[PDB]
Structure 1
Amino acid sequence: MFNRPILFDIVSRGSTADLDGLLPFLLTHKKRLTDEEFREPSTGKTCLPKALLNLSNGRNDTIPVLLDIAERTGNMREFINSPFRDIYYRGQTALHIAIERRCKHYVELLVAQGADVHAQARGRFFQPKDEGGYFYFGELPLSLAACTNQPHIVNYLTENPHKKADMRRQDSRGNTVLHALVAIADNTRENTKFVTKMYDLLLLKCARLFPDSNLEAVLNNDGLSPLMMAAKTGKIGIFQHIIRREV
């Protein structure tokens, strides 16, 4: 039979073998993979995130199966965009996890299949450390991809045939991938190296697409541009780099 613990065990193990029977099961009992019986009741977590949080060499073969089953229970978009709903991981989705676990293949698979690319990770865990969080990257898939130094993913997200992430997008703070980048900045060599490269990457991309929407001009909720934000918060490295490319 199939209940939450059995389903989670199977996916946690990456066993596609054991998923045999699931589709007929759900079909005959009128169940879906998004039904409450199949989520962690605290967080609302489905078995999709469960799968992603148990990779093995960044593989969990049950993922493409779970997706196909959701498709076939008429349920795929809802399934993929099912968000954590608890105060701590609120808003997080399968897409966020694919990005953070650094697996481009699942990002592509997820995006191609309809993943909301502007889903905001809003919960405590995603806010700044000083505000009781763990890692702040501006909440959005793109900003996450940028902040964790994954240019290939960043390019995938901004130019793909399915759904492009708008770079002008802002989080709850009105922060932008640029703002996010400075928040990420910590002045150390390798940090400044990538943060800088990335900043340039996005700035040039946003100029070449959308010829006339200057992204540095988008202010945050504190009405700070990314430049001033760096300034105000001691981000020497990134700040100098911004100025360098003036007149």
Structure 2
Amino acid sequence: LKVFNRPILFDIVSRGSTADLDGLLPFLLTHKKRLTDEEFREPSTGKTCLPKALLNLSNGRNDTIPVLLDIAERTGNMREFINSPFRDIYYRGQTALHIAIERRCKHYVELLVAQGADVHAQARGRFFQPKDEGGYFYFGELPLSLAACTNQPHIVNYLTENPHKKADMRRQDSRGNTVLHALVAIADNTRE
């Protein structure tokens, strides 16, 4: 309530209980703290509250996302909060935009990019590597490449064509692979 620590904040945000965020406005403003500080982020990977909220989705809808984003923008670090990259070597570079895309939630990626989400953050962690290089899923190290590689044409269309910020399909990742190269990389020989 009057004291908001890290485990309590994650406990609230996992369940999506929006009402418990009613006291979130004073505690930060009384203490001149930010959501991006080391106090409120996971120490293992550097994950912040927004990726935790996007990871734990109830029927594809988490009502605490708009409230969290509004409190972040009133705090004054909205830009620094939207795209908080992971820090662990096993998930380096992953962004809340990547988690939104990987969850096949068009509404959340729409609401996230329109307010300052970077559409070129390269998820170049050890988990996002080709299976022959100690990894599980290589989608091209890019939000647009990921959306194209998870068979989500609507989100690809939105990312390419949106008044807020467009990710050009000619952009190359760290490996230099473009969206077409990633789409070839994920391909199998199966018909489907």
Shorter-chain TM-score bucket reads over 0.9
Residues 89-129 of structure 1 show CA distances to partners (whole Å, capped at 9, x for unaligned) of: 10100000000001000000100110000010010001111
Distance 1:41 1:47 in 2: 12
Distance 1:7 1:58 in 2: 21
Residue 137 of structure 2, aligned match among 135, 138, 144: 135
Distance 1:37 1:25 in 2: 13
SS of aligned partner of 1:15? coil
1:163, distance to aligned residue in structure 2 (A): 0.5
Report the identity percentage.
Answer: 99
Is the radius of gyration larger for structure 1 or structure 2?
A: 1
Residue segments in structure 1 that go unaligned for 5+ positions in a row: 190-247
1:18, distance to aligned residue in structure 2 (A): 1.2
1:176, distance to aligned residue in structure 2 (A): 0.6
The structure in which a higher percent of residues are helix is 1
Residues 41-64 of structure 1 show CA distances to partners (whole Å, capped at 9, x for unaligned) of: 121110000000000111111111
Distance 1:177 1:23 in 2: 41
1:179, distance to aligned residue in structure 2 (A): 0.3
Residues 112-159 of structure 1 show CA distances to partners (whole Å, capped at 9, x for unaligned) of: 110000010010001111211110000100000000000000000001
**TM-score between the two structures when normalised by the length of structure 1:** 0.76
Distance 2:85 2:67 in 1: 20
SS of aligned partner of 1:126? coil
1:19, distance to aligned residue in structure 2 (A): 1.3
1:79, distance to aligned residue in structure 2 (A): 0.2
Number of residue pairs the alignment of both structures matches: 189
SS of aligned partner of 1:21? helix
**TM-score between the two structures when normalised by the length of structure 2:** 0.97
Distance 2:131 2:34 in 1: 37
Distance 1:188 1:23 in 2: 52
Residue segments in structure 2 that go unaligned for 5+ positions in a row: none
Distance 1:3 1:187 in 2: 50
SS of aligned partner of 1:40? coil
Residues 171-220 of structure 1 show CA distances to partners (whole Å, capped at 9, x for unaligned) of: 1110010000000100111xxxxxxxxxxxxxxxxxxxxxxxxxxxxxxx
1:27, distance to aligned residue in structure 2 (A): 0.5
Distance 2:159 2:97 in 1: 11
1:85, distance to aligned residue in structure 2 (A): 1.2
Distance 1:105 1:24 in 2: 29
Distance 2:16 2:72 in 1: 17
1:23, distance to aligned residue in structure 2 (A): 1.4
Question: Where do 4+ consecutive residues of structure 1 move more than 2 Å?
Answer: none
Residues 10-56 of structure 1 show CA distances to partners (whole Å, capped at 9, x for unaligned) of: 01001101112011110000111001100011211100000000001
